[PDB]
Amino acid sequence: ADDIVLKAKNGDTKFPHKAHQKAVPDCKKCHEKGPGKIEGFGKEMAHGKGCKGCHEEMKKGPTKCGECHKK
Ligand code: HEC
Ligand code: HEC
Ligand code: HEC
Ligand SMILES: C[C@H](CCC(=O)O)[C@H]1CC[C@H]2[C@@H]3CC[C@@H]4C[C@H](O)CC[C@]4(C)[C@H]3C[C@H](O)[C@]12C
């Protein structure tokens, strides 16, 4: 499958899967979640444990605006 880009108004946010599969061998951090996770995602999740919060917790990955958001 292909990587996905989230169409944030302030700048596209790419999600590169290969880097994540490699750096987060605990797949259940994102996979086999209960229902609702597709509908549930948004800015609040993304800036929390959905994206940015994990980067902060794991001490690796982009945490600055212009590192995730790219026109
Ligand atoms: C969130 C940070 C994830 C982690 C950690 C892992 N996966 Fe993932 N996966 C995630 C998304 C959002 C997607 C769809 C978008 C995409 O970029 O592909 C996927 C997709 C997969 C797939 C299909 C990929 C393909 O190239 O066909 C597989 C087979 C998969 N994920 C498995 C997988 C495993 C085994 C992981 C742990 C080692 C793992 N993923 C981590 C989100 C996230
Ligand atoms: C943990 C459960 C994570 C979640 C959820 C998300 N990301 Fe992540 N990401 C994580 C780690 C540990 C790393 C480091 C990978 C490395 O090898 O450095 C990353 C990395 C990124 C990157 C940069 C990829 C690179 O080539 O260095 C990007 C652009 C990124 N992450 C974006 C991103 C987005 C948009 C997420 C939500 C949709 C997201 N990540 C979730 C760990 C985790
Ligand atoms: C990755 C780890 C991010 C960092 C660091 C920042 N943002 Fe973000 N943002 C991210 C994603 C994946 C999304 C989209 C959520 C979704 O609905 O799919 C967003 C969203 C926004 C938005 C809203 C955009 C819209 O609704 O169209 C804004 C205004 C925004 N982000 C701004 C922003 C700023 C100013 C940041 C630094 C302070 C910042 N983001 C960090 C991912 C990530
Ligand atoms: C469920 C995990 C981890 C965050 C959490 O614990 O909720 C999060 C991390 C990244 C999230 C995905 C980002 C790309 C997509 C954004 C869409 O708007 C909704 C579906 C997708 C596919 C999201 C589904 C799900 O919401 C994921 C995989």
Q: How was this structure determined?
A: X-ray
> How many domains are contained in the chain?
1
Distance 39 CA to ligand 3 centre (A): 17
Rounded distance between C-alpha atoms, residue 66 and residue 29, angstroms: 25
30-44: b (≥16 Cβ within 10 Å) or e: eeeeeeeeeeeeeee
Half-sphere exposure of 2 (CA within 13 A, CB side): 4
- 6, 14, 21, 51, best to mutate for ligand 1 pocket (most atoms within 8 Å of CB): 21
Domain containing residue 5: CATH number:
3.90.10.10
Per-residue H/E/C for the chain: CCCEEECCCCCCEEECHHHHHHHCCCHHHCCCCCCCHHHHCCHHHHHCCCCHHHHHHHCCCCCCHHHHECC
Specify the ligand 4 atom closest to the Cα of 49: 4
Distance 38 CA to ligand 4 centre (A): 6
- Give the domain range for residue 47: 1-71
